[PDB]
Amino acid sequence: SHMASMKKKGSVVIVGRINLSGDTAYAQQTRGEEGCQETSQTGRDKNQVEGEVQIVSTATQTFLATSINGVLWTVYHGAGTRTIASPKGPVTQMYTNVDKDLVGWQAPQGSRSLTPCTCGSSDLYLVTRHADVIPVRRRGDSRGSLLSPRPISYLKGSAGGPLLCPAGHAVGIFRAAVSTRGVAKAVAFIPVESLETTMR
Numbered sequence: 001s002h003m004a005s006m007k008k009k010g011s012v013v014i015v016g017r018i019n020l021s022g023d024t025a026y027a028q029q030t031r032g033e034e035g036c037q038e039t040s041q042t043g044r045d046k047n048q049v050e051g052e053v054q055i056v057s058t059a060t061q062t063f064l065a066t067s068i069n070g071v072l073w074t075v076y077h078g079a080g081t082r083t084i085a086s087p088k089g090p091v092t093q094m095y096t097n098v099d100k101d102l103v104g105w106q107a108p109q110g111s112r113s114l115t116p117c118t119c120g121s122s123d124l125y126l127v128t129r130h131a132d133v134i135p136v137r138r139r140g141d142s143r144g145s146l147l148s149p150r151p152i153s154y155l156k157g158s159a160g161g162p163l164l165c166p167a168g169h170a171v172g173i174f175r176a177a178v179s180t181r182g183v184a185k186a187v188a189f190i191p192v193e194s195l196e197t198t199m200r
């Protein structure tokens with residue numbers, strides 16, 4: 001092909017967060033669309049990062065990314081092999097596993113990391129991009145059922161978000177919804193143990 005005109009993929013850009021610091025969970029936007037587009041091109045993001053759950057965007061998709069053990073994790077089906085924007089330019093993935101639908105980068109300065117759960121509890125909570133905290137009963141290694149099913153529309157854009165135990169530890173990263181007639185009855189997630197193995 002004409003090699004001189006081949007384009008490069010933009011970086012993933014942090015565009016907001018899910019604030020879990022207080023008694024009320026809520027989404028905050030930290031960058032609008034024009035800034036996002038420019039930042040994706042340059043890979044240079046000088047915005048302050050805070051919190052555990054980031055809202056992230058590419059040119060075509062928006063989803064979540066969650067810091068656990070000093071790594072910002074998200075789904076491969078959202079990020080592909082993309083770099084993430086940072087104050088000093090694009091940062092290359094430190095983990096990539098298409099078979100797990102998993103990617104990770106070093107956690108941004110200013111972020112806070114969730115602690116991996118060792119409670120062995122099956123009472124979980126899924127945090128969505130709209131800051132809904134959805135009770136989920138763990139049903140296996142990588143699945144849980146919604147206590148209150150809802151349309152898949154409500155979950156779209158939340159891949160990369162956490163499933164948490166009652167004590168607020170990370171149990172997994174949301175990757176897929178299990179649905180019947182458009183209603184999500186269950187969720188599939190990357191268990192935190194699988195993240196911990198990937199880190200080895």
Ligand SMILES: CC(C)(C)OC(=O)N[C@H]1CCCCC/C=C\[C@@H]2C[C@@]2(C(=O)NS(=O)(=O)C2CC2)NC(=O)[C@@H]2C[C@@H](OC(=O)n3cc4cccc(F)c4c3)CN2C1=O
Pocket residue numbers: 061062063064075077078079098099100101152153155156157158159160174175176177178188
């Ligand atoms: C796996 C099973 C049981 C057959 O189910 C499903 O395939 N179901 C569907 C239902 C889709 C309807 C919307 C559901 C709403 C929210 C879904 C959470 C979500 C999302 O919000 N993405 S996103 O908008 O943020 C997006 C911007 C990031 N993910 C998806 O859509 C994913 C993406 C795609 O799956 C994968 O490419 N892989 C690769 C995997 C490798 C290993 C293990 C896996 F499981 C893998 C899943 C299909 N997906 C589903 O969920």
Ligand SMILES: [Zn+2]
Pocket residue numbers: 116117118119120165166167168169
């Ligand atoms: Zn726990």
